[PDB]
Amino acid sequence: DYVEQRIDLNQLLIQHPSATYFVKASGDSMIDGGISDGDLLIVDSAITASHGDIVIAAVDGEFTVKKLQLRPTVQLIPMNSAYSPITISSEDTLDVFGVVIHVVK
Amino acid sequence: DYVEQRIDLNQLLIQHPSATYFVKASGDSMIDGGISDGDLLIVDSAITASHGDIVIAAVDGEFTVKKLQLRPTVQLIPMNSAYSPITISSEDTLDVFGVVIHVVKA
Numbered sequence A: 001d002y003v004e005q006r007i008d009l010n011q012l013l014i015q016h017p018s019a020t021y022f023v024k025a026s027g028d029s030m031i032d033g034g035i036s037d038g039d040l041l042i043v044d045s046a047i048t049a050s051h052g053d054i055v056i057a058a059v060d061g062e063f064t065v066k067k068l069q070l071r072p073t074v075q076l077i078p079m080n081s082a083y084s085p086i087t088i089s090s091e092d093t094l095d096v097f098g099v100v101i102h103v104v105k
Numbered sequence B: 001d002y003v004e005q006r007i008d009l010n011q012l013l014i015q016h017p018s019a020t021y022f023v024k025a026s027g028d029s030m031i032d033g034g035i036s037d038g039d040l041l042i043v044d045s046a047i048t049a050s051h052g053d054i055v056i057a058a059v060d061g062e063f064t065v066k067k068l069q070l071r072p073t074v075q076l077i078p079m080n081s082a083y084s085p086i087t088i089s090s091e092d093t094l095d096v097f098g099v100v101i102h103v104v105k106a
Helices: A009-013 B009-013
Strands: A020-024 A040-044 A054-059 A062-069 A075-077 A094-104 B020-024 B040-044 B054-059 B062-069 B075-077 B094-104
Touching (some): A020 B054, B020 B094, B040 B054, B062 B094
Antiparallel strands (some): A020 A040, A040 A094, A054 A062, A062 A075, B020 B040, B054 B062, B054 B094, B062 B075
């Protein structure tokens, strides 16, 4: 007869358990993207970011969660009309620490 | 004759170039420890933190630079009398992202 397999969120939401962590989002520079102040972002640091991905990054030593743009130029763009983009020029340092894979609201 | 061997900060300050990054400190929860709002902290993510090390960590998804205490209990303690400690209980999650190896003031 049937056997009830209990729910396992780690198997459901995490591909790389050893390179995945959660970051709490802040502010609302990313609301239009579904992220809001307080949510938990599930971050995978074992995958390489891509144009379009939402990433936890450090620009000039300060952390942020932004959308990665690699073309036409490397930038960190918000998802809230009120905010303005951040271009990563040569005098600027960009550090990508992982790709946000899920947002837990 | 003699040839001047140009200064190289990376060789001088960085042991693991590929696992080292810089974070800018915030607030003054760590002034008595030499860190002040604005400084660059050179972080080595290739060495495992130890009791006493100052680290970049996330407690319940929020990042911080604190001093790691593994004994008598696991905590994140400031270095400013005005601030109070943070214990890492079972209902809390602690994530250590690297040991601060140097503080660069300006």
